[PDB]
Write a protein that binds this ligand. Structure first.
Ligand SMILES: CCCCCCCCCCCCCCCCCC(=O)OC[C@H](COP(=O)([O-])OCC(O)COP(=O)([O-])OC[C@@H](COC(=O)CCCCCCCCCCCCCCCCC)OC(=O)CCCCCCCCCCCCCCCCC)OC(=O)CCCCCCCCCCCCCCCCC
Ligand SMILES: CCCCCCCCCCCCCCCCCC(=O)OC[C@H](COP(=O)([O-])OCC(O)COP(=O)([O-])OC[C@@H](COC(=O)CCCCCCCCCCCCCCCCC)OC(=O)CCCCCCCCCCCCCCCCC)OC(=O)CCCCCCCCCCCCCCCCC
Ligand SMILES: CCCCCCCCCCCCCCCCCC(=O)OC[C@H](COP(=O)([O-])OCC(O)COP(=O)([O-])OC[C@@H](COC(=O)CCCCCCCCCCCCCCCCC)OC(=O)CCCCCCCCCCCCCCCCC)OC(=O)CCCCCCCCCCCCCCCCC
Ligand SMILES: CCCCCCCCCCCCCCCCC[C@@H](O)O[C@H](CO[C@H](O)CCCCCCCCCCCCCCC)COP(=O)(O)OCC[N+](C)(C)C
Ligand SMILES: CCCCCCCC/C=C/CCCCCCCC(=O)OC[C@H](COP(=O)(O)OCCN)OC(=O)CCCCCCC/C=C/CCCCCCCC
Ligand SMILES: CCCCCCCC/C=C\CCCCCCCC(=O)O[C@H](COC(=O)CCCCCCC/C=C/CCCCCCCC)COP(=O)(O)OCCN
Ligand SMILES: CCCCCCCCCCCC(=O)SCCNC(=O)CCNC(=O)[C@H](O)C(C)(C)COP(=O)(O)O
Lengths: 178, 62, 104, 88, 175, 128, 124, 165, 459, 67
């Protein structure tokens, strides 16, 4: 969510992701903590059985067989965290998220209330306006001529520089905005 | 101020409805129709003073 | 759109789309408020057999049970006044056939 | 009302608690900045188990793309603080 | 009350039983009825009395309009537009009156069904046969005329029915 | 070993069950890198306008305009009268009309002929 | 159930059919049968408004029970004897219906037995 | 509260000229009712904690307690009160066989016992892959898997390709 | 009837003599006054119509349409003045003049006693609409839309002119009263069949009938907001009014000449409701929903029963009001984001709650929620169709389901979900827009209390 | 009533909720026992079930197969 993705997943990354998925689905099957722990150590042992394999072809075939086994034996109703993409509270608070630019359209009587907040917002807006040009210049400098190769962004490198493209990352509404 | 809710949310609405039903709705035929009350043997009618005779002396298999 | 990565930082999170990318011809059909093509734990054409078999079995059994109903070892209920001839529609000017019940 | 707002100190204390309840880590040896791969001599599976334990502890899932780079307790604390909007 | 005619809208004598308590326990419905009386029915009655007092000081009348009987469509020649128009207006008025008659009979049937309770199937046969007769008559008069109906189409329907009935009677006379 | 999962139209094949992602060649890696570069360049172009303080309005998306134009205005210029097209058009256009005409005409003919017999039980039918 | 098993698995020709029953005359095996009588008149049931299905031969106990419910309204536990009487009369009616079922079954079985037996005696 | 209606319903279903399959399915559903009630109680209230360590459990609020208390008093006494305070509108079934009188209770006890046995067997340190019947039951008979995908896809596809284009 | 026509004409010099900054105020005030005056025509006699003179008359069918037109003019003026702010004074006065001329032609069309005058005004309505669409439309497709709108109408209307002059030659009159009182059956012949077709196809294409409806999406999408309002609310009802007036002389031929039109209307209402499910443009969805509702009206007119005409009148009025409200709602968002694509702006309920309430009420009236007049008309038509044939209920129920489906689809797509991030120019709703929505919606709900005002002569 | 989290310990309990829960469970069980003492027929049945095989042919009225 926060990290720029890579062009592909290595064999190591796929192996760890399969390990985590198998552990989570086994926990879904093994409701109780002690039985889950027992079968999770068994899974870890079976997983470490081929830890030090040097032939990449047989390792890939083992990975494919393990994925087939996981798909056949997966839990049809695995446990999902409530805020996870499959959870019962995934996008519950999205209707409470209002973008910060809406505060500029407020009536002056509305801004008569909350004066210090709007003064500090004016400070933030001056900061953004005074940093934008340097951000653009830095992005132009640190970019290969054939366009960017990944979705990674550079940090600030000067004394009073801010990391480029920071406004919409810093000014997220909230996770529980109301 | 103790019983303001019970006089404005219950007593006033029932005053209007009872007046509306008693003098406007029931001023036209067949607007409020009640199924007639049940009559049993031994009952006494309020209007005519009639007495309904009892019901045929059970075999009394007590 | 339901099959796309939900952990990616999409430009449109609900839509799960990125600005400037080619859009599928049937995007409005796949908006994930609608038709979903996500892989299922049980194969398609295997769920179909189970569902169709369950419905067909239940229908056939209901028809069989209609042919072979359940009842109690009792006679038909008996009613006093010619099976309540005057009560069930009346017409009291045609002398209904005498329905006579006897004690047992 | 609901639970009190979370704080940085509580996050760090709970992370250290979970890590000190891990058998492959010396309680005395462990530190907030202690690297998992380098200082504690752990492998990738142990890191995956630590990430899963953190998810069980805080009741929220960390995506695999982000969990790959949490190689010290301070990084986990920072990730949790930034996700739940904890600033003090 | 006496506002509506009791012959057009009749009802049975409304026999009601007398209370025959069987226990020393007090009846909550009677106490609630007394409370309702004293708290609702008396203020409403007083307000109505004042309203009627104000109404009595200003009494005026409105009248029911009477319409003469003009010649119908049968006695109008083919292209006499004025007689045709007056006959059509009279026919439309009669159509509205017949609709209201059917409405009255339907109201009687509904009132009987509600009033008779569990014995409506037996105690509402007279209303049912009244409605059957009026429904048959109204159907024969006005059904299948369709939109853009007129007195001429009603006359044509009546004449077709008369021809069919006359042919049936004549063929039965030879049997 | 275990029973196999077969995909279909409405239940596609999972990525982990796809043999394509386990048979990798350097050209596949180059293709993935090219796709990632295209995505990154589009993302940078979008984010330079998204974070612009000066910019006010809706950032136009060429892809959405292309999609709408293709779905609405570009269809007829690319239409050819074809046996497939002609047969499908004739079917989906006039088949249902004649089907419904047959159904309604048969039903109403039965009803009218049954009326002429004097047997429909039209008692109480004063509203139409 | 046993009657269902006998009818559906065994010879259904030996078992009574609930829809068309009884098929034998009511005075066939009996020398004289007493007609069942009523305690409650048609007008009493019409005025009590019981129901078209509650107007059976047990209707008088139902009328008594309903009246006693109406008089002793606040005490809803006081009408025990009337309810017991109505339940007993309904149970007696149900037992009479079971007797009718068993009588039809035995009559049909005996008729079949005797007619095939006289046919067997006539064929030899 | 549930006795005065559900047991009378089972009694009336047993003593009627009714479809045999419907009666059998009603009895099996009566078993399954106790089955999932036992599942809820066993998995939600018994055993050891399985929730995250930070305990926020607190039910000491007068609104919640008062409302649940009111509905509890209702669920305890409304059946008797309402059943005894209405006129008889159904002819009672007074004469029925004893085994057939107790059918509902036997079914409920069987459901309790067997569901409790199968729930107690998950404590064992033994793992097996799910059966096909379990997959059918958990995925709701695959009715939402097929009926929410095939007709909707076909309808929208014909709405675009045929009607519109 | 002159008490309505003359003030409408006076609207022209009044707006041509106004100051550059007072035209909207004056036009709105006097249009509202004219609507108030026209509201007095609802007092109907029952038996016969109100015959003011030899030239004009009022019916229980004409009066709701006249009131709807007079009420629609001020709403059109309120909706227009936002996007015409940069225009010169002369061109704004010309636009208002077009609107006033359209109103005058419409009010004269609905009251003419004679069919040639009705035809003349019913064709005269074309010119102001064409000028509005082709001059103040926004896109480049407005020219093609105007050509479609003109020629589809005229190709049907010219045979109607020929048939009308032939009928007047054969009968001696075309005055509607004489036409009705001296009605004679149409025999079963090819000449009578083609006379029926020439009398019917113009009103068929104005509804529009499915298969002749291709002009409507173009014209309704490419027109300015006021043009779309008047096209959907009033101009579609000219065909229905003409059918109700003209089928008096077509009996008994309509008994079987209506079969292809009934089949087309039912299957095409199904088709257009389905089409609404896959639409990327917000205005086209509203246009196709209008097509479906008018197909239902066509069925109601074709079956020739009193309940059918009552339901058709109620549905015409309700559809006019609802379609105008929906077009205004779409126009507000278009003015915000300058694009008609439905998925461009999402989650507008978070930013505009009162406009979301207006959207919800309009969507509820579009799906004919009880006891709104939309369902009154639809239910009356469905009952009449059921009397015509019991198999029509399948198509009616399918259409109801699909209508609810796309109505709530539009509501969910435009109002729910999360807002589009990059769009940051969505200002709070103006008083003018909220007032326009309220003035659309309140008469709809108020008509529920007195449904007999819009049920028509057959009541 | 202020209750604070406890982090891996049994939550703090108040006397009122415990006594209320115990009282209402006892109320339910007492009601069940009282009803079963007073209305045991509603569960165990009241009227005996006749056995059709215990019925003689004289009272059931069938001839002895010889007529
Ligand atoms: C309001 C609602 C909406 C209504 C409107 C919407 C719907 C209506 C309008 C739109 C749909 C109607 C379109 C009409 C067809 C237009 C054809 C066209 O434009 O061609 C130009 C186009 C351009 O010409 P070109 O570039 O010079 O030619 C190069 C070709 O592309 C090179 O192609 P090729 O060489 O590969 O193939 C050409 C060759 C080979 O063609 C093929 O390979 C395919 C076979 C085509 C012909 C036979 C059809 C085969 C499959 C179906 C067979 C019939 C099944 C039963 C039908 C009834 C079922 C009950 O042609 C043939 O052999 C055909 C010989 C004829 C034999 C059969 C004749 C049957 C006449 C109609 C029977 C059905 C009546 C309706 C029944 C309805 C009952 C309710 O030519 C084509 O490409 C198409 C050729 C095939 C036409 C087949 C038409 C079948 C559709 C039914 C026609 C009847 C409807 C029209 C009524 C008026 C007819 C006089
Ligand atoms: C004298 C008269 C008195 C009679 C008394 C009783 C009479 C005999 C009763 C015996 C009948 C059923 C006994 C229990 C069944 C299951 C026990 C068992 O062995 O467990 C292992 C296993 C459970 O799966 P698993 O792998 O252990 O679960 C994975 C984990 O444990 C997952 O663990 P988890 O954490 O997810 O949760 C576990 C959960 C989930 O556990 C499950 O997965 C079980 C779900 C399905 C089984 C539930 C049984 C209900 C069957 C109703 C079917 C009606 C007909 C439908 C027709 C379908 C046609 C395709 O378990 C539960 O919590 C409760 C489950 C059910 C407990 C209550 C069951 C009792 C009600 C049924 C008997 C009624 C008794 C009174 C009789 C009333 C009338 C006389 O069961 C099986 O493998 C087979 C189940 C047998 C079902 C057969 C369905 C009948 C119709 C078949 C088709 C007929 C036609 C022929 C084909 C078509 C030809 C064209
Ligand atoms: C049935 C209840 C009876 C209550 C008696 C008093 C009712 C007076 C209401 C007068 C009419 C409402 C005007 C509609 C425009 C919206 C107003 C507005 O902008 O809100 C500002 C205002 C200020 O709020 P805010 O804090 O500034 O922010 C508001 C936000 O924008 C967001 O706020 P929001 O999200 O809460 O949305 C505002 C609200 C307003 O939005 C609406 O949709 C309300 C309109 C209902 C649907 C309209 C089309 C459906 C067809 C029904 C036609 C009925 C016409 C009857 C004659 C009406 C006379 C004008 O939306 C809703 O509450 C949910 C709508 C669901 C309504 C479902 C009703 C179905 C039929 C029920 C029975 C209808 C016949 C009655 C007789 C039946 C036989 C006894 O909010 C309100 O005051 C809420 C309005 C009250 C809700 C009325 C719902 C039922 C009333 C239906 C008509 C009344 C019939 C009276 C006859 C006797 C009964
Ligand atoms: C996309 C939408 C466009 C608008 C749709 C408009 C629909 C117009 C269709 C008109 C409906 C029917 C027209 C006439 C009714 C019957 C037609 C005919 O087929 O019926 C038979 C007629 O017999 C033969 O079929 C003659 C007609 C055959 C020639 C017509 C060609 C039809 C081919 C279809 C061409 C498409 C037309 C529409 C073009 C767009 C009846 O037999 P018969 O009782 O003896 O004749 C009755 C007439 N009499 C009394 C004068 C004797
Ligand atoms: C009798 C007339 C009607 C008969 C039914 C005809 C078929 C109806 C076809 C309707 C097509 C409408 C498509 C447009 C809807 C937009 C897309 C959509 O709805 O998405 C499907 C959406 C999302 O799926 P979920 O699984 O819930 O997702 C949750 C996790 N993501 O779910 C739905 O709403 C789909 C609903 C489809 C219903 C179609 C099946 C109905 C069949 C009924 C037949 C049985 C009749 C009943 C018999 C009763 C006994 C007398
Ligand atoms: C934009 C799409 C809309 C298309 C609508 C077009 C259809 C219009 C209907 C037909 C138009 C011509 C009608 C002619 C006017 C009627 C007058 C009349 O009834 O006179 C007839 C004359 O009838 C005719 O001449 C009709 C012949 C047709 C001439 C033109 C044919 C063009 C195509 C006709 C079929 C298409 C019409 C319907 C299609 C609708 C659109 C697809 C009989 O007169 P007499 O000669 O005196 O006979 C009695 C004494 N012997
Ligand atoms: C509940 C239902 C779930 C059940 C589904 C089935 C589960 C699978 C069963 C068996 C799976 C296997 O054997 S999978 C085969 C495993 N073998 C290999 O991966 C060989 C090469 N090893 C490496 O590349 C790294 O050492 C690595 C291992 C990635 C660690 O990396 P770190 O040390 O740098 O973290």
């Amino acid at each position: 969510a926060f990290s720029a993705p890579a062009a592909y997943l290595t064999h190591q990354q796929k192996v760890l992701r399969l390990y985590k998925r198998a552990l989570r689905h086994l926990e879904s099957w093994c409701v109780h903590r002690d039985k889950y722990r027992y079968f999770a150590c068994l899974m870890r042992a079976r997983f470490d059985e081929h830890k030090n394999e040097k032939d990449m072809v047989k390792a890939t075939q083992l990975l494919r067989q393990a994925e087939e086994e996981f798909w056949y034996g997966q839990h049809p109703q695995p446990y999902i965290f409530p805020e996870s993409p499959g959870g019962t509270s995934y996008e519950r608070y999205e209707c409470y998220k209002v973008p910060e630019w809406c505060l500029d359209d407020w009536h002056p009587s509305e801004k008569a209330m909350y004066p210090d907040y709007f003064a500090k917002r004016e400070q933030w807006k001056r900061l953004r306006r005074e940093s934008w040009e340097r951000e653009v210049k830095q992005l132009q400098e640190e970019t290969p001529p054939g366009g960017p190769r990944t979705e990674a962004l550079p940090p600030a490198r000067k004394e009073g520089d801010l990391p480029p493209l920071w406004w919409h990352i810093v000014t997220r509404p909230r996770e529980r905005p109301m | 101020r103790h019983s303001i809710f019970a006089v404005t949310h219950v007593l006033i609405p029932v005053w209007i409805i009872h007046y509306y039903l008693k003098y406007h709705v029931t001023a036209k035929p067949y607007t409020v129709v009640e199924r007639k009350p049940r009559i049993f043997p031994g009952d006494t009618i309020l209007e005519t003073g009639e007495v309904i005779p009892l019901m045929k002396e059970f075999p009394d298999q007590h | 759109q339901q099959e796309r990565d939900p952990w990616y930082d999409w430009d449109h999170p609900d839509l799960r789309l990125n600005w400037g990318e080619p859009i599928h011809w049937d995007l409005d059909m796949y908006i994930r408020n609608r038709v979903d093509t996500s892989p299922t734990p049980v194969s398609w054409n295997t769920m179909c057999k189970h569902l169709f078999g369950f419905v067909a079995f239940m229908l056939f059994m209901f028809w069989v049970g209609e042919i072979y109903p359940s009842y109690q070892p009792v006679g038909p209920k008996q009613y006093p006044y010619n099976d309540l001839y005057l009560e069930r529609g009346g017409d009291p000017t045609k002398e209904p056939e005498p329905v006579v019940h006897y004690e047992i | 009302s609901d639970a009190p707002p979370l704080t940085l100190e509580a996050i760090k204390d709970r992370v250290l608690y979970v890590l000190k309840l891990y058998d492959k880590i010396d309680p005395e040896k462990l530190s907030v900045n202690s690297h998992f791969m380098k200082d504690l001599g752990l492998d990738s599976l142990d890191q995956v188990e630590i990430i899963m334990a953190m998810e069980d502890e805080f009741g929220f899932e960390i995506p695999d793309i982000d969990a790959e780079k949490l190689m010290c307790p301070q990084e986990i604390v920072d990730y949790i603080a930034d996700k739940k909007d904890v600033y003090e | 009350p006496d506002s509506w005619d009791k012959d057009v809208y009749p009802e049975p004598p409304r026999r009601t039983p007398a209370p025959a308590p069987q226990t020393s326990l007090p009846n909550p419905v009677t106490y609630l009825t007394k409370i309702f009386d004293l708290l609702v029915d008396r203020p409403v009655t007083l307000a109505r009395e004042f309203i009627e007092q104000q109404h009595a000081k200003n009494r005026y009348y409105y009248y029911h309009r009477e319409f003469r009987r003009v010649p119908d469509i049968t006695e109008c020649e083919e292209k006499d537009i004025l007689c045709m128009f007056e006959a059509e207006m009279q026919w439309r008025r009669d159509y509205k009156v017949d609709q209201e008659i059917v409405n009255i009979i339907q109201e009687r049937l509904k009132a009987c069904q509600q009033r008779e309770g569990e014995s409506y199937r037996q105690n509402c046969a007279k209303e049912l046969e009244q409605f059957t007769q009026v429904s048959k008559a109204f159907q024969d008069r006005y059904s299948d005329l369709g939109a853009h109906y007129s007195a001429r189409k009603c006359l044509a329907k009546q004449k077709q029915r008369m021809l069919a009935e006359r042919k049936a009677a004549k063929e039965a006379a030879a049997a | 070993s275990f029973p196999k999962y077969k995909p279909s139209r409405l239940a596609t094949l999972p990525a982990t069950l796809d043999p394509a992602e386990y048979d990798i060649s350097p050209e596949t890696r180059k293709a993935q890198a090219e796709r990632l570069a295209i995505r990154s360049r589009l993302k940078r172009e979008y984010l330079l306008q998204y974070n612009d303080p000066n910019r006010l309005g809706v950032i136009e998306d060429p892809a959405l305009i292309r999609w709408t134009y293709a779905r609405s205005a570009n269809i007829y210029p690319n239409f050819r009268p074809t046996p497939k097209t002609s047969l499908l058009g004739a079917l989906f256009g006039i088949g249902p009309l004649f089907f419904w005409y047959y159904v309604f005409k048969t039903d109403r003919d039965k009803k009218e002929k049954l009326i002429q017999e004097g047997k429909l039980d039209q008692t109480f039918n004063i509203s139409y | 159930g046993a009657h269902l098993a006998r009818r559906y698995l065994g010879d259904a020709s030996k078992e009574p059919d609930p829809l068309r029953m009884p098929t034998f005359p009511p005075d066939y095996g009996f020398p004289e049968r007493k007609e069942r009588e009523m305690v409650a008149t048609q007008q009493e049931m019409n005025d009590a408004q019981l129901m078209l299905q509650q107007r059976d031969y047990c209707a008088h106990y139902l009328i008594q029970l309903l009246k006693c419910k109406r008089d002793s309204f606040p005490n809803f536990l006081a009408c025990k004897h009337e309810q017991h009487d109505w339940d007993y009369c309904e149970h007696l009616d149900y037992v009479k219906r079971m007797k009718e079922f068993e009588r039809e079954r035995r009559l049909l079985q005996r008729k079949k037995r005797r007619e095939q037996r006289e046919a067997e005696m006539a064929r030899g | 509260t549930g006795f005065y209606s559900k047991d009378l319903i089972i009694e009336a279903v047993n003593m009627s000229y009714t479809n045999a399959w419907a009666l059998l399915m009603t009895l099996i559903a009566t078993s399954l009712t106790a089955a999932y009630s036992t599942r809820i109680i066993f998995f939600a209230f018994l055993g050891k904690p399985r929730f995250p360590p930070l305990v926020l459990i607190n039910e000491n609020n007068p609104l919640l307690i008062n409302s649940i208390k009111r509905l509890l008093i209702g669920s305890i006494f409304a059946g008797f009160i309402i059943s005894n305070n209405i006129p008889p509108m159904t002819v009672p079934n007074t004469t029925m066989p004893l085994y057939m009188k107790m059918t509902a209770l036997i079914v409920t006890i069987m459901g309790f016992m067997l569901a409790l046995e199968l729930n107690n067997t998950t404590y064992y340190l033994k793992f097996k892959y799910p059966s096909q019947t379990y997959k059918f039951s958990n995925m709701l008979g695959y009715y939402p898997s097929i009926m929410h995908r095939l007709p909707t896809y076909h309808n929208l596809s014909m709405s675009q390709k045929s009607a519109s284009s | 009837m002159l008490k309505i026509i003359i003030p409408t004409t006076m609207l022209l010099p009044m707006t041509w003599m106004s100051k550059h900054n007072m035209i909207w105020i004056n036009a709105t005030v006097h249009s509202l006054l004219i609507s108030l005056i026209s509201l007095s025509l609802l007092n109907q006699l029952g038996e016969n119509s109100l015959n003011f003179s030899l030239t004009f008359f009022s019916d229980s069918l004409s009066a709701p349409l006249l009131v709807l037109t007079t009420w629609l003019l001020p709403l059109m003026l309120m909706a227009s003045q936002s996007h015409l702010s940069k225009e010169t004074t002369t061109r704004k006065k010309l636009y208002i003049t077009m609107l006033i001329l359209l109103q005058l032609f419409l009010i004269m069309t609905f009251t003419a006693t004679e069919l040639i005058l009705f035809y003349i005004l019913f064709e005269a309505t074309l010119v102001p609409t064409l000028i509005i669409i082709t001059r103040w439309g926004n896109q480049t497709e407005r020219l093609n839309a105007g050509l479609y709108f003109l020629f589809y109408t005229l190709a049907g209307s010219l045979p109607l002119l020929v048939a009308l002059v032939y009928i007047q030659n054969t009968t001696g009159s075309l005055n509607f009263l004489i036409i009705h009182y001296w009605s004679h059956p149409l025999s079963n012949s090819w000449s009578n069949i083609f006379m029926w077709l020439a009398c019917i196809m113009a009103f068929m294409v104005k509804m529009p009938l499915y298969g002749l409806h291709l002009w409507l999406p173009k014209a309704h999408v490419e027109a300015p907001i006021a043009g779309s309002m008047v096209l959907a609310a009033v101009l579609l009802k000219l065909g229905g009014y003409g059918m109700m007036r003209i089928t008096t002389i077509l009996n008994p031929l309509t008994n079987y000449m209506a079969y292809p039109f009934l089949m087309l209307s039912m299957w095409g209402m199904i088709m257009t409701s389905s089409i609404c499910l896959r639409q990327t443009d917000l205005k086209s969805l509203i246009a196709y929903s209008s097509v479906s509702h008018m197909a239902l009206v066509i069925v109601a007119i074709m079956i020739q029963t009193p309940w059918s005409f009552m339901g058709a009148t109620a549905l015409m009025i309700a559809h006019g009001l609802t379609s105008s409200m929906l077009f205004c709602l779409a126009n507000t968002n278009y003015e915000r984001v300058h694009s008609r694509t439905m998925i461009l702006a999402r989650g507008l309920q978070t930013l505009l709650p009162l406009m979301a309430t207006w959207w919800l009420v309009a969507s509820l009236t579009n799906l004919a929620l009880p006891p709104s007049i939309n369902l009154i008309g639809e239910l009356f038509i469905i009952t009449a169709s059921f009397s015509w044939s019991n198999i029509t209920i399948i198509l009616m129920g399918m259409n109801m389901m699909i209508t609810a489906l796309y109505s709530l689809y539009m509501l969910i797509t435009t109002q729910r979900g999360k807002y589009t991030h990059h769009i940051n120019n969505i200002k709070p709703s103006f008083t003018r827009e909220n007032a326009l929505m309220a003035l659309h919606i309140l008469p709809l709900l108020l008509l529920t209390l007195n449904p007999k005002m819009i049920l028509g002569p057959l009541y | 009533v202020h209750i604070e989290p406890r982090y891996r310990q049994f939550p703090q309990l108040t006397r009122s909720q415990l006594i209320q829960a115990e009282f209402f469970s006892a109320t339910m069980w007492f009601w069940i026992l009282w009803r079963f003492w007073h209305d045991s027929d509603a569960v165990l049945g009241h009227f005996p079930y006749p056995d059709p095989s215990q019925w003689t042919d004289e009272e059931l009225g069938i001839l002895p197969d010889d007529e």
